[PDB]
């Protein structure tokens, strides 16, 4: 009992590591694949189920399925399998030796929390654990006490206004739009260009393509006009088979779905509008502080120029008499994990944990009252 | 006075005048060329027998389908078939009347631009338009709300619709179609003991499937009854006179639609895709979509398909409402009927695309014309 482990069950990726380290020791995507063919060779009885980078490597003969969908778990067997894999094969640390820290998106069903706590306390018999929010850990990592969080993850995008020493639970907005919808729209448009991708392996391929050759546009109409003069914007990507794909307007089209959800057909508003509404719902005095500090985190906000576009949109919407500043740290991908590690390292938090004795005597409902 | 509607089906071509209730030209899309030396010089030899005749003399030709899974691969063959249909069969000049074209959803823009350019440049048609087969199916069915199952020879797709509007974000296209079924049927006929490789035997197997295939309500029960193979086997007469006995293959190949894993495709069946498409829609319109399910295409004529689809959907869907399947007995030409009705509409007389606006604007105009 010297340190604790912080695990972030990201909607598309899993981050884990020791409490104290500045970088995670295990970064693999959440994939639980199973064979799709029959199998003929006899010198192999291998691993009916496949998880982790192994699944990514041999994805061509597997039906990849994401255990977590838009922040809510759908298959508990897959999640338990990934937990076992991360704990044993990668970390090689027994659950009893150290406690575990878990994080989840806001406004999630209580059933998921109760089931997760019960499984953690019963199966792995962890000495203690806790449940937190990614946004607060983002604040802790950023070393600030006031601001607004833009936690645009792979599965869920949400904001949580905060003030010095307190939060505003009544001004929390959660949007289902996230990276998966962007990937689906990218596949749909790549179809309109002439390239077809359906199965999950090509889903990963398109995910990589978006990760490598996508960016946001300051002005949509101007970018479209410059695309009409398509002689300096098209770029080429090399597929595993060697085929070359030329991508033009699709580079700056899919990211615009965040600001224009109507493209996918969702009757909602963009991230800028939702943040403006959330800040407006807050008290007048704290609006200045919230404007002066705008923390963003998640893997969906690494597109170059996103910060500038958000700043321009907010300033246009907000009154043009004050200053709006956007802070974009270059390590926002692991901000949640860093915040969790720092929180665990805090001396005062050594007593806030939930142990087996109190959990057994009270019941699973205890976590509900533990910091909401 | 009228307009011509042409449906470039993945395996067949339908054409006729706007107003008629039945097509005036129904021939398969075949563009065949001689394989042999070209030795004869007397009475009739032609470099490329493409068209209706091709079927008759298929034994000495390398038949090739110009269109593959809804996307054109050889433009010369398509232009040849267009010329044949316009002149030899219809005997109507392109200038006299306009032309209507239909294509599957989620097709590349390059195909549309090339087709529009060729139509406007080569045949100099006064005007034309591009539409979707599913919407024409709705028009033919005389309904405004439902879900379309357009399972053609090359592509199967669904497009949810509501009163006066559509849902472009809930469109799913599946490459599985009749050609894959024919290939699987050939593969299984090989396992029985009968071999078929060339294109002529491909047509023979296509006819066999068209005549002696049906769907099974329960796969396991049908397999067990096949174990007692004394009432299910049927015989077919080949052109040479040989008799082929077909048993389990009658209800095996159609099951590939509900079980794509047979061919090795990592996808889902038509029932699953329709369920996913309807679920992606808004909650309120789900009731209307369930209450109306239009299907069309030449791949959905197998007896019992409607009953199996109804059973599967009801099993998947909650068992508290009523699910109805509508199976008109003329779904083969539903697209053509819908196109003719749409052309006959007075309001559509102005939506056409003419040569002047096309030339001044460019081929990109069709892209913005109703998506």
């Amino acid at each position: 009992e010297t340190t604790a482990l912080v695990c972030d069950n990201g909607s598309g990726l899993v981050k884990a590591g020791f409490a104290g380290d500045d970088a995670p020791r295990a970064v693999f995507p959440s994939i639980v694949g199973r064979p799709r063919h029959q199998g003929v060779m006899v010198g192999m009885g291998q691993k009916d189920s496949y998880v982790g980078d192994e699944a990514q490597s041999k994805r061509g003969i597997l039906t990849l399925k994401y255990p977590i969908e838009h922040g809510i778990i759908t298959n508990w067997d897959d999640m338990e399998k990934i937990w076992h894999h991360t704990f044993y094969n990668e970390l090689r640390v027994a659950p009893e030796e150290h406690p575990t820290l878990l994080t989840e998106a806001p406004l999630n069903p209580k059933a998921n929390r109760e089931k997760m706590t019960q499984i953690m306390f019963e199966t792995f018999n962890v000495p203690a654990m806790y449940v937190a929010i990614q946004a607060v850990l983002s604040l802790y990592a950023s070393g600030r006490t006031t601001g607004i969080v833009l936690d645009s993850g792979d599965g869920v995008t949400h904001n949580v206004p905060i003030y010095e020493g307190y939060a505003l639970p009544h001004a929390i907005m959660r949007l289902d739009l996230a990276g998966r919808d962007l990937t689906d729209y990218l596949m749909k448009i790549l179809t309109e260009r002439g390239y077809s991708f359906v199965t999950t392996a090509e889903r990963e391929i398109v995910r990589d393509i978006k990760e490598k050759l996508c960016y946001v546009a300051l002005d949509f109409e101007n970018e479209m006009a410059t695309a009409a003069s398509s002689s300096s914007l098209e770029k080429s990507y090399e597929l595993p088979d060697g085929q070359v794909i030329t991508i033009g307007n699709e580079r700056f089209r899919c990211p615009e779905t965040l600001f224009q959800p109507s493209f996918i057909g969702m009757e909602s508003a963009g991230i800028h509008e939702t943040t403006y509404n959330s800040i407006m719902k807050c008290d007048i005095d704290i609006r200045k502080d919230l404007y002066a500090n705008n923390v963003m985190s998640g893997g969906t906000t690494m597109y170059p120029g996103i910060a500038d576009r958000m700043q321009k949109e907010i300033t246009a919407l907000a009154p043009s008499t004050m200053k709006i500043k956007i802070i974009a740290p270059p390590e926002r991908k692991y901000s949640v994990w860093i915040g969790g590690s720092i929180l665990a390292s805090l001396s005062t938090f050594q007593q806030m944990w939930i142990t087996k004795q109190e959990y057994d005597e009270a019941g699973p409902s205890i976590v509900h009252r533990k910091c909401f | 006075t009228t307009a011509l509607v042409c449906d470039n089906g993945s395996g067949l071509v339908k054409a006729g005048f706007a107003g008629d209730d039945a097509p005036r030209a129904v021939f398969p899309s075949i563009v065949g060329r001689p394989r042999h030396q070209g030795v004869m010089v007397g009475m009739g030899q032609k470099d490329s027998y493409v068209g209706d005749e091709a079927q008759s003399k298929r034994g000495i030709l390398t038949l090739k389908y110009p269109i593959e899974h809804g996307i054109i691969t050889n433009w010369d063959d398509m232009e040849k078939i267009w010329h044949h249909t316009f002149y030899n069969e219809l005997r109507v000049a392109p200038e006299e009347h306009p032309t209507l074209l239909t294509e599957a959803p989620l097709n590349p823009k390059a195909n549309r631009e090339k087709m529009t350019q060729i139509m406007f440049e080569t045949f100099n048609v006064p005007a034309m338009y591009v539409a979707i087969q599913a919407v024409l199916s709705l028009y033919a069915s005389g309904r405004t709300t439902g879900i379309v199952l357009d399972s053609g020879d090359g592509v199967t797709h669904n497009v949810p619709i509501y009163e006066g509007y559509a849902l472009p974000h809930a469109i799913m296209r599946l490459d599985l179609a009749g050609r894959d079924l024919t290939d699987y049927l050939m593969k299984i006929l090989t396992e029985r003991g009968y071999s078929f490789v060339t294109t002529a035997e491909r047509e023979i197997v296509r006819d066999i499937k068209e005549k002696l295939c049906y769907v099974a309500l329960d796969f396991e029960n049908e397999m067990a009854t096949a174990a007692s193979s004394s009432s299910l086997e049927k015989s077919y007469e080949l052109p040479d006179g040989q008799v082929i006995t077909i048993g389990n293959e009658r209800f095996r190949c159609p099951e590939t639609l509900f079980q794509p894993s047979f061919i090795g495709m990592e996808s889902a069946g038509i029932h699953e895709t329709t369920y996913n498409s309807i679920m992606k829609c808004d909650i309120d319109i789900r009731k209307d979509l369930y209450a109306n399910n239009v299907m069309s295409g030449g791949t959905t004529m197998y007896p019992g398909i409607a009953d199996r689809m109804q059973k599967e959907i009801t099993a998947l869907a909650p068992s508290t409402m009523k699910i109805k399947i509508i199976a008109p007995p003329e779904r083969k030409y539903s697209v053509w009927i819908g196109g003719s009705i749409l052309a006959s509409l007075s309001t559509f007389q102005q939506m056409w695309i003419t040569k002047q606006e096309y030339d001044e604007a460019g081929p990109s105009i069709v892209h913005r014309k109703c998506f």
Binding site: E69, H70, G71 | M279, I283
Partner: peptide, 7 residues
Amino acid sequence: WXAXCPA
């Protein structure tokens, strides 16, 4: 989700 939306 369980009711409304998929998740």
